[PDB]
Design an enzyme around this catalytic site. Structure first.
Site, mmCIF file in Angstrom:
data_model
loop_
_atom_site.group_PDB
_atom_site.id
_atom_site.type_symbol
_atom_site.label_atom_id
_atom_site.label_comp_id
_atom_site.label_asym_id
_atom_site.label_seq_id
_atom_site.Cartn_x
_atom_site.Cartn_y
_atom_site.Cartn_z
ATOM 1 C CD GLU A 35 -13.232 -9.719 8.403
ATOM 2 O OE1 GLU A 35 -12.012 -10.004 7.965
ATOM 3 O OE2 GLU A 35 -13.779 -9.049 7.694
ATOM 4 C CG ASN A 46 -5.523 -8.599 2.496
ATOM 5 O OD1 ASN A 46 -5.318 -7.552 3.128
ATOM 6 N ND2 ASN A 46 -6.417 -9.531 2.850
ATOM 7 C CG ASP A 48 -3.233 -5.019 -1.044
ATOM 8 O OD1 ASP A 48 -2.876 -5.954 -0.241
ATOM 9 O OD2 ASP A 48 -3.725 -3.842 -0.841
ATOM 10 C CB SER A 50 -1.968 -4.932 2.677
ATOM 11 O OG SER A 50 -3.482 -5.447 2.308
ATOM 12 C CG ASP A 52 -6.869 -8.482 5.980
ATOM 13 O OD1 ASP A 52 -6.537 -7.341 5.802
ATOM 14 O OD2 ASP A 52 -7.551 -9.060 5.529
ATOM 15 C CG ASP A 101 -11.965 5.183 6.522
ATOM 16 O OD1 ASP A 101 -11.722 6.268 6.572
ATOM 17 O OD2 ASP A 101 -11.225 4.278 6.072
#
Ligand SMILES: [Cl-]
Ligand SMILES: [Cl-]
Ligand code: NA
Length: 129
Positions: A35, A46, A48, A50, A52, A101
């Site tokens: 990551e 990202n 969209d 957003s 990370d 989650d």
């Protein structure tokens, strides 16, 4: 801060990631490796909108507030900048919420694509754990 592999393994173990939600310590180190390349300051925008954040690339869509992802949730109730500290406590705590989650560590696309089903034990090998 760019963690050493064993340094991150020790920090994650200390913070409760070893076998958290049944994911052995090597899974988290591997996830963090692919990551963020062990870089706490790793950020990736990202498509969209957003972003990370941090050693575990925790996404601002759901988990942290960066003030620039409309319609987000901030489920870990943290500024996304808290995920970039040399102290991985906020990332770990948030990762625990992410891994709990429902999808487990599949929430980390790099873990599913590059760590899931691999010999993740190799990532904590040689670490005085
Ligand atoms: Cl730490
Ligand atoms: Cl799971
Ligand atoms: Na957010």
């Amino acid at each position: 801060k760019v963690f050493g592999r064993c340094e991150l393994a020790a920090a994650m173990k200390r913070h409760g990631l070893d076998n958290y939600r049944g994911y052995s310590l090597g899974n988290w180190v591997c996830a963090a490796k692919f990551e963020s390349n062990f870089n706490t300051q790793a950020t990736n925008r990202n498509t969209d909108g957003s972003t990370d954040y941090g050693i575990l690339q925790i996404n601002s869509r759901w988990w942290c507030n960066d003030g620039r992802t409309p319609g987000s949730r901030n489920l870990c109730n943290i500024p996304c900048s808290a995920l970039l500290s040399s102290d991985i406590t906020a990332s770990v705590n948030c990762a625990k919420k992410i891994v709990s989650d429902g999808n487990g560590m599949n929430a980390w696309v790099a873990w599913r694509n590059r760590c899931k089903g691999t010999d993740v034990q190799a990532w904590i090998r040689g670490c005085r754990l």
